[PDB]
Amino acid sequence: SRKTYTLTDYLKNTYRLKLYSLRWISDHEYLYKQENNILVFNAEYGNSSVFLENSTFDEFGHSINDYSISPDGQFILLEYNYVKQWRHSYTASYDIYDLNKRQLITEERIPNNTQWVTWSPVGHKLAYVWNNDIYVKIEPNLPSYRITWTGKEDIIYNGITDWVYEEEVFSAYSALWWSPNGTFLAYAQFNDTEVPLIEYSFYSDESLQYPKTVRVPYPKAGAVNPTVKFFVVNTDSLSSVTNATSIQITAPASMLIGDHYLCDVTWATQERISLQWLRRIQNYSVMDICDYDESSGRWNCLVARQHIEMSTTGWVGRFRPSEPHFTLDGNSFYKIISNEEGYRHICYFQIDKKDCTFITKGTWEVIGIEALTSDYLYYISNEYKGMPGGRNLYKIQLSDYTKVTCLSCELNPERCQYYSVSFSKEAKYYQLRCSGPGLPLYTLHSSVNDKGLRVLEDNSALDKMLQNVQMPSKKLDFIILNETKFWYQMILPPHFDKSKKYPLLLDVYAGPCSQKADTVFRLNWATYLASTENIIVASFDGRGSGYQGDKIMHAINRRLGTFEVEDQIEAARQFSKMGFVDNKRIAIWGWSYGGYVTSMVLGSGSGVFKCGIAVAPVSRWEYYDSVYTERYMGLPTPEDNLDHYRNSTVMSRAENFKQVEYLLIHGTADDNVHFQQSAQISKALVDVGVDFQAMWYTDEDHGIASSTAHQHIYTHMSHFIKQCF
Amino acid sequence: SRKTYTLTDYLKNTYRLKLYSLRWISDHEYLYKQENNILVFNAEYGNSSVFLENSTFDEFGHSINDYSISPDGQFILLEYNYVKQWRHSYTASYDIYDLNKRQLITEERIPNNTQWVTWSPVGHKLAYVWNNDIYVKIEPNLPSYRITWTGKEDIIYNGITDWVYEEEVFSAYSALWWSPNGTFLAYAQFNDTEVPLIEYSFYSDESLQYPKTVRVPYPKAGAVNPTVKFFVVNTDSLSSVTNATSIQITAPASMLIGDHYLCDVTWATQERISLQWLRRIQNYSVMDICDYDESSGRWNCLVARQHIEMSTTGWVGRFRPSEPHFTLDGNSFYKIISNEEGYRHICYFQIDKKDCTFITKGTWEVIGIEALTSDYLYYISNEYKGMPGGRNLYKIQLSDYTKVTCLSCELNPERCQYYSVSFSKEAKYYQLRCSGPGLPLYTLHSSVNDKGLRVLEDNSALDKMLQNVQMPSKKLDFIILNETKFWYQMILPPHFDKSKKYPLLLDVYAGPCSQKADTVFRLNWATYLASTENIIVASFDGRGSGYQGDKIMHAINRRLGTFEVEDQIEAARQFSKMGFVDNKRIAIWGWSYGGYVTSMVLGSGSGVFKCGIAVAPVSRWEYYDSVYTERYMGLPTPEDNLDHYRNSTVMSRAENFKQVEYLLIHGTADDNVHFQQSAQISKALVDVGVDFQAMWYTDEDHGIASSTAHQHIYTHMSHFIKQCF
Amino acid sequence: KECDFTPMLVGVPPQVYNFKRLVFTNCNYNLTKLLSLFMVNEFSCNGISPDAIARGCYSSLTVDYFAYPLSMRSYIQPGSAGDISLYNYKQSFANPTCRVLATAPANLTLTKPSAYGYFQKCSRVSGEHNSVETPLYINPGEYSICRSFSPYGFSEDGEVFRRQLTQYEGGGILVGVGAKLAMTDKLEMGFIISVQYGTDTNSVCPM
Ligand SMILES: *[C@@H]1O[C@H](CO)[C@@H](O[C@@H]2O[C@H](CO)[C@@H](O[C@@H]3O[C@H](CO)[C@@H](O)[C@H](O[C@H]4O[C@H](CO)[C@@H](O)[C@H](O)[C@@H]4O[C@H]4O[C@H](CO)[C@@H](O)[C@H](O)[C@@H]4O)[C@@H]3O)[C@H](O)[C@H]2NC(C)=O)[C@H](O)[C@H]1NC(C)=O
Ligand SMILES: *[C@@H]1O[C@H](CO[C@@H]2O[C@@H](C)[C@@H](O)[C@@H](O)[C@@H]2O)[C@@H](O[C@@H]2O[C@H](CO)[C@@H](O)[C@H](O)[C@H]2NC(C)=O)[C@H](O)[C@H]1NC(C)=O
Ligand SMILES: *[C@@H]1O[C@H](CO)[C@@H](O[C@@H]2O[C@H](CO)[C@@H](O)[C@H](O)[C@H]2NC(C)=O)[C@H](O)[C@H]1NC(C)=O
Ligand SMILES: *[C@@H]1O[C@H](CO)[C@@H](O[C@@H]2O[C@H](CO)[C@@H](O)[C@H](O)[C@H]2NC(C)=O)[C@H](O)[C@H]1NC(C)=O
Ligand SMILES: *[C@@H]1O[C@H](CO)[C@@H](O[C@@H]2O[C@H](CO)[C@@H](O)[C@H](O)[C@H]2NC(C)=O)[C@H](O)[C@H]1NC(C)=O
Ligand SMILES: *[C@@H]1O[C@H](CO)[C@@H](O[C@@H]2O[C@H](CO)[C@@H](O)[C@H](O)[C@H]2NC(C)=O)[C@H](O)[C@H]1NC(C)=O
Ligand SMILES: *[C@@H]1O[C@H](CO)[C@@H](O)[C@H](O)[C@H]1NC(C)=O
Ligand SMILES: *[C@@H]1O[C@H](CO)[C@@H](O)[C@H](O)[C@H]1NC(C)=O
Ligand SMILES: *[C@@H]1O[C@H](CO)[C@@H](O)[C@H](O)[C@H]1NC(C)=O
Ligand SMILES: *[C@@H]1O[C@H](CO)[C@@H](O)[C@H](O)[C@H]1NC(C)=O
Ligand SMILES: *[C@@H]1O[C@H](CO)[C@@H](O)[C@H](O)[C@H]1NC(C)=O
Ligand SMILES: *[C@@H]1O[C@H](CO)[C@@H](O)[C@H](O)[C@H]1NC(C)=O
Ligand SMILES: *[C@@H]1O[C@H](CO)[C@@H](O)[C@H](O)[C@H]1NC(C)=O
Numbered sequence A, B: 001s002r003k004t005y006t007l008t009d010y011l012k013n014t015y016r017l018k019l020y021s022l023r024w025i026s027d028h029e030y031l032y033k034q035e036n037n038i039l040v041f042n043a044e045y046g047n048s049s050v051f052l053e054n055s056t057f058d059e060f061g062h063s064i065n066d067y068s069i070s071p072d073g074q075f076i077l078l079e080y081n082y083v084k085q086w087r088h089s090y091t092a093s094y095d096i097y098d099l100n101k102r103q104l105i106t107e108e109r110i111p112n113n114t115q116w117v118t119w120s121p122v123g124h125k126l127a128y129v130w131n132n133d134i135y136v137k138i139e140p141n142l143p144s145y146r147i148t149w150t151g152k153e154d155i156i157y158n159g160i161t162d163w164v165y166e167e168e169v170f171s172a173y174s175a176l177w178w179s180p181n182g183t184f185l186a187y188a189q190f191n192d193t194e195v196p197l198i199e200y201s202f203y204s205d206e207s208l209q210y211p212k213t214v215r216v217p218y219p220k221a222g223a224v225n226p227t228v229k230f231f232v233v234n235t236d237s238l239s240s241v242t243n244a245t246s247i248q249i250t251a252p253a254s255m256l257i258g259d260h261y262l263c264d265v266t267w268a269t270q271e272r273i274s275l276q277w278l279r280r281i282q283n284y285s286v287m288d289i290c291d292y293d294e295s296s297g298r299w300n301c302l303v304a305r306q307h308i309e310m311s312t313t314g315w316v317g318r319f320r321p322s323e324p325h326f327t328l329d330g331n332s333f334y335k336i337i338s339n340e341e342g343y344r345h346i347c348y349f350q351i352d353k354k355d356c357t358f359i360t361k362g363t364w365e366v367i368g369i370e371a372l373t374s375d376y377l378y379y380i381s382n383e384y385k386g387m388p389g390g391r392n393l394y395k396i397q398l399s400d401y402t403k404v405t406c407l408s409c410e411l412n413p414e415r416c417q418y419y420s421v422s423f424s425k426e427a428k429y430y431q432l433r434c435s436g437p438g439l440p441l442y443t444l445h446s447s448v449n450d451k452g453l454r455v456l457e458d459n460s461a462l463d464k465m466l467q468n469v470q471m472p473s474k475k476l477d478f479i480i481l482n483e484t485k486f487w488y489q490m491i492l493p494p495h496f497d498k499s500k501k502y503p504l505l506l507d508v509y510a511g512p513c514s515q516k517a518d519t520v521f522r523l524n525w526a527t528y529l530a531s532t533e534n535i536i537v538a539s540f541d542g543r544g545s546g547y548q549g550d551k552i553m554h555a556i557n558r559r560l561g562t563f564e565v566e567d568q569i570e571a572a573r574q575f576s577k578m579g580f581v582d583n584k585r586i587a588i589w590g591w592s593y594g595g596y597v598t599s600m601v602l603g604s605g606s607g608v609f610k611c612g613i614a615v616a617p618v619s620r621w622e623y624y625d626s627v628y629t630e631r632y633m634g635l636p637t638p639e640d641n642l643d644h645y646r647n648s649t650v651m652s653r654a655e656n657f658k659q660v661e662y663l664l665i666h667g668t669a670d671d672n673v674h675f676q677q678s679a680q681i682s683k684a685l686v687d688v689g690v691d692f693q694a695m696w697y698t699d700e701d702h703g704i705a706s707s708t709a710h711q712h713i714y715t716h717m718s719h720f721i722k723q724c725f
Numbered sequence C: 001k002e003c004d005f006t007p008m009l010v011g012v013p014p015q016v017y018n019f020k021r022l023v024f025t026n027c028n029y030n031l032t033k034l035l036s037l038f039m040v041n042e043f044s045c046n047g048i049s050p051d052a053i054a055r056g057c058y059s060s061l062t063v064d065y066f067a068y069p070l071s072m073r074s075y076i077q078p079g080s081a082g083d084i085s086l087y088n089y090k091q092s093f094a095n096p097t098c099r100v101l102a103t104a105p106a107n108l109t110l111t112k113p114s115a116y117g118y119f120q121k122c123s124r125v126s127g128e129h130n131s132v133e134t135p136l137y138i139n140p141g142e143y144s145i146c147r148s149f150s151p152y153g154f155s156e157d158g159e160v161f162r163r164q165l166t167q168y169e170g171g172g173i174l175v176g177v178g179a180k181l182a183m184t185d186k187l188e189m190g191f192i193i194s195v196q197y198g199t200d201t202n203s204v205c206p207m
């Protein structure tokens, strides 16, 4: 009778979720931005004041994209002329504004086309990267100093990462690390001389007569990989008369026999650093702790401080080895590792000894470590009610490990089950974020007695609007296979009835260490399908999924494309046994790795599914990058796992596609999963004679995030499902 | 009931048309291939003999693609290892077999990867091109001689054409011309030093890991064109001790003041040659006649022997200036030239005088000149019954121009209205080929008294097969617009009744100097649609069509996309008023240029059409080659025709596509109409928010001629038409 | 007196169409040493005996020199129709003259140029649609209009040049094409000596 969630509501963003983003600038105060005004809030009382007014922004003369404020509070950094590159990279222009004298600096400006810029932890020092070289400015007024002289385009990188390190190792563009009190600067250098190149065409605007080719250094499986070095420089001894000096730290002898990576960099104290190295065969890692010698001005790394992490059933860590959390004095640290039973918990180390002592145990996992004080440790786990999809905050006393307290278990049981936290400088105040089964909620608390101060956001405006709209519901449950529990989720249409029959659509990602069944509130394409078209949307977590144990996670080691494909089919059969699912109308779709699973399921010959959609899929594992593929599959070489590379190809199953419908979508300027992979799928289907549908998007990347392209793809997909059902 | 023509029959070639291909080797003998044997026939009596048996072929050990025989009948040339490059280009290996002493020559073999080989008109000389250089062999068993030393890949071409000359000017890959008795050899040279390059991607099978990039020199509208030179060499003075000497012939001074092309080369006598030149603005041409001086060894070209051809309404020639036909003494020639009324006829020239004298006149055009004898001249025209779609053979007496006789008009008034001819060496015998309304027929005739000797092929086998299959009929008629007649054709379903209503499909090319209404018998996709699906398929010739006069042909000069588009729309309105067409089901589709017209018709907003298909379309005239585009449009500059370049794009009509259904098909590796053009259409439609369908084919050229892709594309289009209706 | 023939043997020689002219008046000459210095492949005199011109008093003695290949000997003749006479250089028979074709022994102060060269064609274009095409022919003992461009030589054979003519010159567009020949082992030169002499004004006398 009333209105429902329509496709226009999803595409035009009629109903909005409103957030609360804050930046801690001290132990007591944080920053906020409201009506384009920056305000300073006192955490204890809620009093506020104006830090910067919007009238000053108007007189600058440009459009400001983002800002940064120095730790001391004397200068502000402005960013404009934003040009995007890859996922975490960009190019912009910067200006510096002085708050004390209320004016703009016009001497020794930061040059255009800058790649990165950062402040020091204390003071007002600057370090930026321009033309693949590093510069340091002690004062914003004074000229800059040059540190590196060997930068080159697409060959040598200083202070910034290449493709594989930005996408698969660091998940960031920066390769600069400041000392805790601003004395030293550490950076890494990458060399891409022998790495092959990938070429694709870019068409650009209508006025361009000749298309241009883009060349990117990209290593595929079994190719040549870049090399890495590490340097440390001292910024208090810089002089303009002579060039600066850098000291190199060498990898341990156990990693110099062959290829290796650099995983993590962390500062322990003012004169102590820690580095982690990983072999090309990603089941062996070594952590090194290094010190500074005043007599010689050199960094020494001795054998007795090294620690070794290895795995016999798979790879090290979830994606990469975890980071350590050092104490104030720097003689011990905490870290997350896997125990004998296969569950990840926190263990306590000493820099000299080899063994370490666990402090947590049980049939659950610890997601991360958030804060460390002199008496308590804060972490996030999924212990509560034995639900892997939940998240909660706990604290543990360092003197006695038996005393564990939950801080977010019982604040609001029916509304909130998924949590995140943000702490202050010395962990006196913290902010809790609840995505939750219900509406998001934001609150502020004090750590002295765990007392709730006030409420920052409740999303009361959205609740009033949604009372007039018919909305779906969410159900979370599990099934048992081989005496093992596997979890699933379902989105159900309004006024659900057990007697009636509904069509079913299956959403799959099924990547290693992934979770699709959780307790998060979302408004997306699935909401449209259930609310208006009365379609059930379901997801399933099977073998290869994470946050449940190493036995489940490591089941697909060296055997990608075998067990996760079969698990999805078995779940569909179980769903069909329930009374309310129609056997004739079942479909499947996915993105990226999900497209790979969707293609193999349709070509399996099971006869359970009818139609499917694949968006930017992977077809052959030799077309993907080395770091991701070799982690789970090994080298593509005859003496080590070459047969399985050939048996896991989508093109080998083209004949079975005659029994199902198929839709294929891919963007031409895609840089993560290249357009080559979809081109080879279509050629195989044409050779055998299968009828299918295809679609290409010009000058679109992996996400297809352009405003016009986003609306087009979802309208096209909606029509395909309606005719299939 | 009886069976009907099906899609499987068209794809698998169930019903075949038989041919009779012969090669004249003397004035009364020719060669034929029966059961992989070469036979010799005498035209006077019909006797037969064996020239080469199939056992010899099997002894070689390789698959032989084609054969050539020397004029003296002593050697045979064998070809294998065939690799195709462009429409008229390829590469292969060759061997020479001696017929008199019956063995294979194993000394001084022709190198692998040879580009072009040709025999001399008299004798057994050879000339071949390898690595862009010219070689000559006096005898098959002797070493070769080198003539050129400047050949280099993708820059300098000697003896062969580049992309633009091969596709748009010469329609051939060869650039070597022999003298009538083998004394001289003439060739052309091109540099492409400043011509831009076009780049696209090639994927090349599953085993390849990195895609390949293809670079081809390709001049677009307003870019830089190549340059041409002409040389003549003497083959009777070659020696091993010294390098050869080549004499250059320079273009006339009226052509050296700017850019120009070379369009025709012809030999007049043993020591006389004729060349034709064309300006970049293709409405001015010059013909030169040059002789040989024995005293100096040079070539002299006289100003008094030059002839000028101009056009005021448009360009010169149909596609390029026509070729001369010299007499025996070389002091006069015949040529086809448009007259004062705009109709093409024959002049008679004297090499020293400027004026013509026309020997034919009327409201019809002469198609071509076939043979010339000291008493009579033979040609093909469309005078009979005033039908522009017909062809017939005529003979004219040189002494008195009043006596004209038709040789194929009343041979069989039905079943044959379209003819072609092939003469012998001295024009003593000829073969007539009919592809008229009825099944093809081949006959042999004499020239002394014009009596039919025998029937070579009658396709009696196919007639019996088609007797039990329902087949469509064809109608040819005309309509009147603005007191002018325009011709059309219709394919009609079996048992046609004027009372009923049928859907209509319009097939469009509508290019300059093109004809889609004629009397030719075909078995194609249109036969399937009428026989099985009961659909009328129609074609219409409007303004811009050829073989009717310069008034109709030149109406689209400097205005492309204006008059030919509106003509197609008006034809559909006229078809609707006849009475047997359903107004609600009308569609249109086209190829190449037809795709351009189809897209412009759909975007006009007339509302007459419902759905349409465009395969490999042209989007913007600035993306296409210079020689073709500048012939009808001019340069793209503000001083000359730039406004109409911008107003004739498909991307400016994207908003009107919301009222129709659209299908877009293109090939990835297309070198003629690049994938860029279809990529820009998709981007424009996505920007305005229009829903459509698309399909790409991997590693397919302009024609999409691979067996697997040929069957796929015609199955996909059939589903689209059936769903639309 | 004491007229010097040193510039003839000093520096790089010029091309055929850019010939340099030296006039001698009231001076003593030594033709024997010049002829003996060069290896004379051909020595011909028209209207005067070779010994008479060597030991005969004259009024004005004019010598024009240029670099010319030995192979193309037949083109520089009193009767010829080659490209050398039509455009590049045409001999004059107004007064008796001698033509000398010799080779430098390479022991002198001569610098071998890059290559020989001459003009294949030189013409003028005008009309309604640039279609008149009137050729230009050089008068004897004169200069070619095409010589302004490419004064020293051609980079490659078959070069094409264009220039716009003024009202005084005649109007239209001038077009010309040049040729190139490879250099021989030793330098080859051509000398033309002509005298305009009066009986009572024989200022120049042999030494
Ligand atoms: C296919 O096309 C390409 C490109 O169009 C051709 O390559 C071009 O070749 C020409 C050769 O003429 C070349 O032009 C010369 O380039 C030289 C580079 O340094 C220039 O120095 C030179 O100028 C001199 O020569 C002119 C002609 O002689 C003179 O008129 C001019 O004043 C200059 O004079 C110098 O030389 C004389 C001696 O001759 C000396 O006394 C003077 O003091 C002075 O020093 C020409 O401009 C182009 O640059 C080339 N184009 C390029 C490389 O892009 C190619 O040749 C074509 N294919 C074939 C087979 O020919
Ligand atoms: C025949 O010519 C070749 C090539 O020389 C080039 O082309 C000629 C037409 C002319 O224009 C020459 O000036 C060009 O240089 C000669 O091969 C060259 O020989 C020289 C000397 O031995 C050597 O330095 C080069 O490297 C050679 N070039 C190549 C490409 O090999 C050949 O010697 C000539 N034949 C005779 C008999 O002289
Ligand atoms: C917000 O208000 C509180 C109390 O009104 C301020 O705290 C006082 O600050 C003044 C000067 O900063 C001190 O002299 C007082 O001793 C403070 N009193 C208390 C109880 O803390 C606070 O500074 C204000 N903050 C802002 C940002 O305006
Ligand atoms: C710092 O190092 C750079 C390069 O290592 C020095 O720059 C070089 O100086 C020498 C001597 O003048 C030049 O020959 C090089 O060409 C310079 N290289 C570059 C890349 O510019 C620079 O001189 C050093 N600074 C000081 C103070 O010595
Ligand atoms: C053509 O058919 C005739 C059969 O009569 C033969 O041709 C004869 O050839 C010989 C040899 O040159 C001549 O002397 C005869 O005069 C020819 N006969 C006639 C009637 O012209 C022969 O069998 C056949 N030849 C070929 C090449 O097929
Ligand atoms: C060939 O085409 C050109 C381009 O249209 C013609 O040049 C034009 O000629 C007319 C007549 O004098 C002038 O009014 C225009 O200004 C010219 N256009 C340009 C761009 O110069 C040329 O006349 C045509 N040739 C012939 C023989 O008609
Ligand atoms: C600028 O700040 C003032 C301060 O409250 C506010 O009232 C005003 O709305 C702001 N302007 C804009 C455009 O938001
Ligand atoms: C950045 O480019 C602008 C545009 O030319 C220029 O005005 C400005 O000075 C540049 N910035 C620097 C630091 O040179
Ligand atoms: C920063 O740390 C270094 C390392 O001990 C120390 O020497 C220096 O004095 C510190 N700076 C300040 C301002 O305390
Ligand atoms: C990068 O590597 C190449 C060889 O792979 C080496 O020659 C080069 O010196 C390296 N770059 C630097 C800055 O050392
Ligand atoms: C795992 O590490 C061990 C110890 O370094 C090594 O022997 C083994 O080969 C590694 N796994 C694989 C699959 O190579
Ligand atoms: C259960 O075990 C059987 C046989 O051991 C196996 O085929 C199947 O894949 C297993 N299923 C799961 C979910 O582990
Ligand atoms: C070879 O020629 C003979 C003689 O006519 C014929 O019978 C046979 O069929 C031919 N075979 C092939 C494979 O061409």
Ligand SMILES: *[C@@H]1O[C@H](CO)[C@@H](O)[C@H](O)[C@H]1NC(C)=O
Pocket (backbone or CB within 6 Å): B109, B110, B111, B112
């Ligand atoms: C062509 O290639 C084959 C195979 O490599 C070789 O045997 C033959 O000699 C080649 N042809 C010539 C003329 O060298």
Ligand SMILES: *[C@@H]1O[C@H](CO)[C@@H](O)[C@H](O)[C@H]1NC(C)=O
Pocket (backbone or CB within 6 Å): B181, B182, B183, B270, B271
């Ligand atoms: C071929 O033509 C040339 C050119 O006139 C002539 O000299 C020669 O005699 C003719 N015949 C032969 C056999 O070369």
Ligand SMILES: *[C@@H]1O[C@H](CO)[C@@H](O)[C@H](O)[C@H]1NC(C)=O
Pocket (backbone or CB within 6 Å): B481, B482, B566
């Ligand atoms: C006939 O003339 C009218 C009047 O301008 C015009 O609109 C129409 O396009 C013409 N049709 C044809 C076929 O020439």
